């Protein structure tokens, strides 16, 4: 009946850091999927198991809009079965991922001359991420066999590194706002329809 709050997710003033990726549950609303275009410099729209052509002909039990910022190179890692720092440690898509990955260049917004250090990513982790896992822990990563004592030092690194986006970065290092639409299918009334 009411419009799904995609403008909140896509047009958010600040996206979440990819290590702390924002998840927005989309439910009980009409999902207008042709509104997903912000006239962005490098738009990306790839779906899996679902058809982006006429995406508004299907009901879904729940839609999970996951939003975060990575750099241009790492957008390829937002895809099923991909490997890399973002997929392993920040945002892993399942092999059977049912949904779409929307990404676009946000150098206008998320880059600063002095360097935008708002956006972080997890550089180290004892293990990779389960699909849709989120690790916001700032516990010092233990690379050596000595203790870390909660402070960064030799073989003890803070697991989060900042992108430091600057507008003069190359396209592969420029910030890219990424929205992952995760379409859920259950035994439930499937209350996310809408042409």
């Amino acid at each position: 009946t009411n419009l799904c709050p995609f403008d909140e997710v896509f047009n958010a003033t600040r996206f979440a850091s990819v290590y702390a990726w924002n998840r927005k549950r989309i439910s009980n609303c009409v999902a207008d999927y042709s509104v997903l275009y912000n006239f962005a410099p490098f738009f990306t729209f790839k779906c899996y198991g679902v058809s982006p052509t006429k995406l508004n002909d299907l009901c879904f039990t729940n839609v999970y809009a996951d939003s975060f910022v990575i750099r241009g190179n790492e957008v390829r890692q937002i895809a099923p079965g991909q490997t890399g720092n973002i997929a392993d440690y920040n945002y892993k898509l399942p092999d059977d991922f049912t949904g779409c990955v929307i990404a676009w260049n946000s150098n206008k917004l998320d880059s600063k001359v002095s360097g935008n250090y708002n956006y972080l990513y997890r550089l180290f982790r004892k293990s990779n991420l389960k699909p849709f896992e989120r690790d916001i822990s700032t516990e010092i990563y233990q690379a050596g066999n000595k203790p870390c004592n909660g402070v960064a030092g030799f073989n003890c690194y803070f697991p989060l590194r900042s992108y430091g986006f600057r507008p003069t970065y190359g396209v592969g290092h420029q910030p890219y706002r990424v929205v992952v639409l995760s379409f859920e299918l259950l035994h439930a009334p499937a209350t996310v329809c809408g042409p």
Binding site: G144, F154, N155, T168, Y169, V171, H173
Partner: protein, 596 residues
């Protein structure tokens, strides 16, 4: 958790922190070099200091992982490069002593001034003052004055500093387990643990000396022909059998014989190819020059310049109030930011340099995917060689005709080619004995094979014997004539210009072979040959990841530096030189000096 894994994880931290801090330093250096302000000075120093302090911190951090415990050679390469960066090998006093010496020698070189003997009020710096004399003056005494005054006033200042510089630099090298500082410099070519591609530091001297032997016949005939032409212009100053006076070689040291072309051009009637007028005729600008340069690398399958290149590069002089350091440099700031700083004029020379500097960019973009510590040329000579071969193809009449800068009604006779090769040999061939002998002297000085009381004795013994160049004024050991050159007094290895010269023709010969080029090598343009660009790219993307021997083989099919392509490039001149030196003495006598 092993210790290679620790190093792997440590390099992961360093790569991400270094790229950010290096970018800030590079951009701060960029903003100074395009907007010369006392602010942009300061921000450059602050970013440079924060980058050096990070590197010193990471160098000490990297050393806590011993090398014998890493099997991964890629990790060991980055770890070794970070540990070899370790400044804490000398005592903080001797490190401070050395840095003070390096700054003072650098300051003496860049601020050293000589004043006219008749009127001591007017004083000249090396650049542009003394360099203007050395490159353009035809007057013997004025050239003798500027050559001697630079070495007598500025060189003598550097003698005590260079003596202490050698001691501390050797002490540094001996503490890094190198034989001496010359051995330390030769470590740039060292390869270990890669069977079939290993290369020792000592092998560099042998390869340089072995290849210089094959250079000698070409150089002696070039030296003999240049001497014969200079002797005609200076009958009372040049012996037909003696060495060339050091002040009559085209620059302050005879590093290049380029400015001898006017006095040594084979056929001065036939005009040289200069498309500068054609560029102005067609209303070319700096944007057109780099677009044409970008078009050249696209033709060989290399990518176009990034969108940030055109936006963020400086391709023209800002002029007006905004001053800039106009030295043509290609900038790899990291994180996808590749720029060219160049105060480009609408001239053929700047047209070729744009191809040259963009050639560095193509090298930078190709290994941008490599780890930060491996983002460099395969060795010190690779990057310069890559840039040189672009200007080689871009300057050919075939390339200049294909882009509408040389009209088809121009035809190339063998006399203009001999003219062109002679000009090339003056710069390219003439520098090799200068480069080898200078670096040989520095190698022997670091090795201790030259005592302090025979530095200038041996420096000029080797100048006469190897370069065929004689000092015009006797020099005692109060002089330091090598330090009168930038690289010696500014602590830069010099054999890179010898190896690069042999690399570039190895590269060009291979790419032209890939381009299916028929004819003499010097006429070759690699344009529109994706096979040539692919063969070049298979090395460019390597960066420092693979041994330079392998990166060389990925282009030329040979694991070692080879002089044959250099001689192949100059063979039409070499045969012409031997014919032209039919009734001329080839070789030189070291005993002859213009001061009798």
């Amino acid at each position: 958790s092993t210790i290679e894994e620790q190093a792997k994880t440590f390099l992961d931290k360093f790569n991400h922190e270094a790229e950010d801090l290096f970018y800030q330093s590079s951009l701060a250096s960029w903003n100074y070099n395009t907007n010369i302000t006392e602010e942009n000075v300061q921000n450059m120093n602050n970013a440079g200091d924060k980058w050096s302090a990070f590197l010193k911190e990471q160098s000490t951090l990297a050393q806590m992982y011993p090398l014998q415990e890493i099997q991964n050679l890629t990790v060991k390469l980055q770890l070794q490069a970070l540990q070899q960066n370790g400044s804490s090998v000398l005592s903080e006093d001797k490190s401070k002593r050395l840095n003070t010496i390096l700054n003072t020698m650098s300051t003496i070189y860049s601020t050293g001034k000589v004043c006219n003997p008749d009127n001591p009020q007017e004083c000249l710096l090396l650049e542009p003052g003394l360099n203007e004399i050395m490159a353009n003056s035809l007057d013997y005494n004025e050239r003798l004055w500027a050559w001697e005054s630079w070495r007598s006033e500025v060189g003598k200042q550097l003698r005590p500093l260079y003596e202490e510089y050698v001691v501390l630099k050797n002490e540094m090298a001996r503490a890094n387990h190198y034989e001496d500082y010359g051995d330390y410099w030769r470590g740039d070519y060292e390869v270990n643990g890669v069977d079939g591609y290993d290369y020792s530091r000592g092998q560099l001297i042998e390869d340089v000396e072995h290849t210089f032997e094959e250079i000698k016949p070409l150089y002696e005939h070039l030296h003999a022909y240049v001497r014969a032409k200079l002797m005609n212009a200076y009958p009372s100053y040049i012996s037909p059998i003696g060495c060339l006076p050091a002040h009559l070689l085209g620059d302050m040291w005879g590093r290049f014989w380029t400015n001898l072309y006017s006095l040594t051009v084979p056929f001065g009637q036939k005009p040289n190819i200069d498309v500068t007028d054609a560029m102005v005729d067609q209303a070319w600008d700096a944007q057109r020059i780099f677009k044409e340069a970008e078009k050249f690398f696209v033709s060989v399958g290399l990518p176009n310049m990034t969108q940030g290149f055109w936006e963020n590069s400086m391709l023209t002089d800002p002029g007006n109030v905004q001053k800039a350091v106009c030295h043509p440099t290609a900038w790899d700031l990291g994180k996808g930011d590749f720029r060219i700083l160049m105060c480009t004029k609408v001239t053929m020379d700047d047209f070729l340099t744009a191809h040259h500097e963009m050639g560095h960019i193509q090298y930078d973009m190709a290994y941008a995917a490599q780890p930060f510590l491996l983002r460099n040329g395969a060795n010190e000579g690779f990057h310069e060689a890559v840039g040189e071969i672009m200007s080689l193809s871009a300057a050919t009449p075939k390339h200049l005709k294909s882009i509408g800068l040389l009209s088809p009604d121009f035809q190339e006779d063998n006399e203009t080619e001999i003219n062109f090769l002679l000009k090339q040999a003056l710069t390219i061939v003439g520098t090799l004995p200068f480069t080898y002998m200078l670096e040989k002297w520095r190698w022997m000085v670091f090795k201790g094979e030259i005592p302090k009381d025979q530095w200038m004795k041996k420096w000029w013994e080797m100048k006469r014997e190897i370069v065929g160049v004689v000092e015009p004024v006797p020099h005692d050991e109060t002089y330091c004539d090598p330090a009168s050159l930038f690289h010696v007094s500014n602590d830069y290895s010099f054999i890179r210009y010898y190896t690069r010269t042999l690399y570039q023709f190895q590269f060009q010969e291979a790419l032209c072979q890939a381009a299916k080029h028929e004819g003499p090598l010097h006429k070759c343009d690699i344009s529109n040959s994706t096979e040539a660009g692919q063969k070049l790219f298979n090395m460019l993307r390597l960066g420092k990841s693979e041994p330079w021997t392998l990166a060389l083989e990925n282009v030329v099919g040979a694991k070692n530096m080879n002089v044959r392509p250099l001689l192949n490039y100059f063979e039409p001149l070499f045969t012409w030189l031997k014919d032209q030196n039919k009734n001329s003495f080839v070789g030189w006598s070291t005993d002859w000096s213009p001061y009798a």
